[PDB]
Write a protein that binds this ligand. Structure first.
Ligand SMILES: O=C(Nc1ccnc(NC(=O)C2CC2)c1)c1ccccc1Cl
Ligand SMILES: O=C(Nc1ccnc(NC(=O)C2CC2)c1)c1ccccc1Cl
Length: 539
């Protein structure tokens, strides 16, 4: 379970906006200054306080243009509070009820498309929202003015569901999937979506409004079909969505297929960038989370921006521009400081962040730890094929969205085709405890040096980045100074110990990787099959 930690001092609570199940929503401010909303959870049952925190987790590990941003969770005495993105026009059903008779079906189709896109995203990630209703859809941009179009953000689902009472599940009918009545199918969000489309078509009026909880239950028991909307093939889409048998409900790829058919660059300006938080310090500078809102309408995208010799900084940007791979951090563009002042690197925001901070948070097993390892090799083997040495492979520089992403290209160099190794004396810091004996002793960097660097990250994966059991601390226990004592240590054959509960088979690879002679080390291409075979072992 993962979300960012928010302090009680950072938040301020404002006007009460309304109530959700077991919650009281407030406008607020985040001192990281920032307009937010505070969903406050009433002092409640553990089973439900956890299902609230489970939601914050689902939402802190996702990144989509049509999903409302979760800043983190804060504890203000007896109450659990979640800091969410404040959206200008608020709950969609409320808005539709007030805009009754001034909303075209063209406008509703854009919304339907956007919502389906946010759920198509969740579907690919095998994640379930569970509370898709117009109240949990927020209106950022109106889209009523000529030349414009609506923009929505699907908000957090609040307390889980099923964690909730049965007579509360009955109150959520017809948004509630019928299978969910006896107290998790990804098929439940295709029922909620279809029920939401009816809510949207009927301009905020809930279908089955004038029915008692007992009357609602009867409708589901007797399986009466839900009302047909306005028109056209939307009634077809709605109907398939609203099938009591979950297996018959169409996929969000098919929903978004039907919807897209029903229809009629690298320059970032500092002005449109609005900081959220800092993300970490790397080689060359700080990475900070930004929001890039060019239209100022609160519909921008979340980017990671890195700042701050100048020549070697440019090199970081030039290398990253030319790398396209599933496990390497993605280049987006550039930002110019001031009149010649400096250049800024715009990247993709990686929801779960560095492994170094993620690992001592839920002691994840061999299946997960090894999956990461094989991927770092999948990403490193591609880097090496592009004729570059990394020189900075550590767990601090390995990011993860789900469950995966290799960053910090500050030390990466290009090896000219002919040359065996690359000489670098430095004039900066270097992760010595992740460097091979030839790197420390003679300043020589072979492709083989990154493989040494790998085995060291592989160690951290298995120590769960334990600060007491870490490459700098453990290699220093062996002494009682610099790289010189380290050089002789490794030259004797002395290695980092085996982490507790590290399968001996895994610790063999680390040893293979920590070969003194660089030419005796396995290649990154050679390690992928080896890691696949082993990853198809610890289940
Ligand atoms: O979704 C809610 N509120 C949100 C979330 C983010 N932004 C807003 N913005 C506004 O309400 C603006 C119109 C004033 C509301 C909300 C508010 C009260 C009660 C229950 C819920 Cl679920
Ligand atoms: O790129 C870096 N960090 C990034 C980039 C994109 N997303 C994240 N995500 C987070 O930090 C999560 C916790 C919010 C980190 C970064 C920062 C310092 C050192 C090495 C790297 Cl690879």
């Amino acid at each position: 379970l993962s979300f960012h930690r928010v302090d009680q001092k950072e938040i301020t609570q404002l006007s009460h906006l309304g109530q959700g199940t077991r919650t009281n929503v407030y406008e607020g401010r985040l001192r990281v200054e920032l307009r937010v909303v505070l969903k406050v959870l009433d002092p409640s049952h553990h089973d439900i306080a956890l299902a609230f925190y489970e939601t914050a987790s689902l939402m802190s590990q996702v990144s989509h243009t049509h999903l409302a941003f979760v800043h983190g969770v804060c504890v203000r005495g007896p109450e659990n509070i979640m800091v969410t993105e404040y959206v200008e026009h608020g709950p969609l059903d409320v808005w539709l009820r007030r805009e009754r008779g001034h909303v075209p079906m063209a406008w509703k189709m854009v919304v339907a498309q956007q919502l389906a896109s946010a759920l198509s995203y969740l579907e690919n990630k095998n994640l379930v929202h569970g509370n898709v209703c117009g109240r949990n859809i927020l209106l950022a941009r109106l889209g009523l003015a000529e030349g414009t179009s609506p923009f929505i953000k699907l908000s957090d689902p609040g307390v889980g569901l099923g964690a909730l009472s049965r007579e509360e599940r009955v109150e959520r009918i017809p948004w509630l999937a019928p299978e969910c009545l006896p107290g998790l199918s990804t098929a439940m969000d295709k029922w909620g979506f279809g029920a939401t489309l009816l809510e949207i078509c009927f301009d905020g009026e809930a279908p089955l409004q004038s029915r008692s909880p007992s009357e609602k239950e009867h409708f589901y028991q007797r399986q009466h079909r839900l009302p047909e909307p306005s028109c056209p093939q939307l009634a077809t889409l709605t109907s398939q969505c609203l099938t009591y048998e979950p297996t018959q409900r169409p996929s969000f790829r098919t929903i978004l297929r039907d919807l897209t058919r029903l229809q009629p660059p690298t320059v970032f300006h500092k002005r449109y960038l609005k900081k959220i938080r800092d993300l970490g310090e790397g080689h060359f500078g700080k990475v900070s989370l930004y929001c890039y809102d060019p239209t100022n309408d609160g519909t921008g995208e979340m980017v990671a921006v890195k700042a701050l010799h100048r020549s070697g900084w440019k090199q970081e940007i030039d290398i990253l521009r030319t790398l396209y791979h599933e496990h390497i951090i993605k280049y987006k563009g550039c930002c110019e400081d001031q009149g010649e002042k400096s250049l800024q690197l715009v990247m993709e925001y990686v929801p779960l962040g560095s492994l170094r901070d993620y690992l001592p948070r839920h002691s994840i097993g061999l299946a997960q730890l090894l999956l990461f390892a094989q991927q770092i090799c999948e990403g490193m083997a591609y880097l090496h094929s592009q004729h570059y040495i990394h020189r900075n492979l550590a767990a601090r520089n390995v990011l993860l969205d789900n469950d995966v992403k290799i960053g910090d290209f500050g030390l990466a160099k290009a090896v000219p085709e002919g040359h065996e190794y690359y000489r670098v004396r430095e004039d900066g810091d270097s992760p010595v405890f992740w460097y091979a004996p030839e790197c420390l002793k003679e300043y020589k960097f072979y492709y083989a040096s990154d493989v040494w660097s790998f085995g060291v990250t592989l160690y951290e994966l298995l120590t769960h980045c334990d600060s007491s059991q870490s490459p700098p601390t453990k290699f220093l226990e062996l002494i009682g100074m610099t790289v010189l004592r380290l050089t002789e240590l490794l030259e004797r054959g002395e290695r980092l110990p085996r982490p507790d509960k590290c399968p001996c088979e895994v610790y063999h690879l680390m040893k293979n990787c920590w070969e003194t002679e660089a030419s005796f080390r396995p290649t990154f291409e050679n390690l992928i099959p080896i890691l696949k075979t082993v990853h198809e072992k610890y289940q």
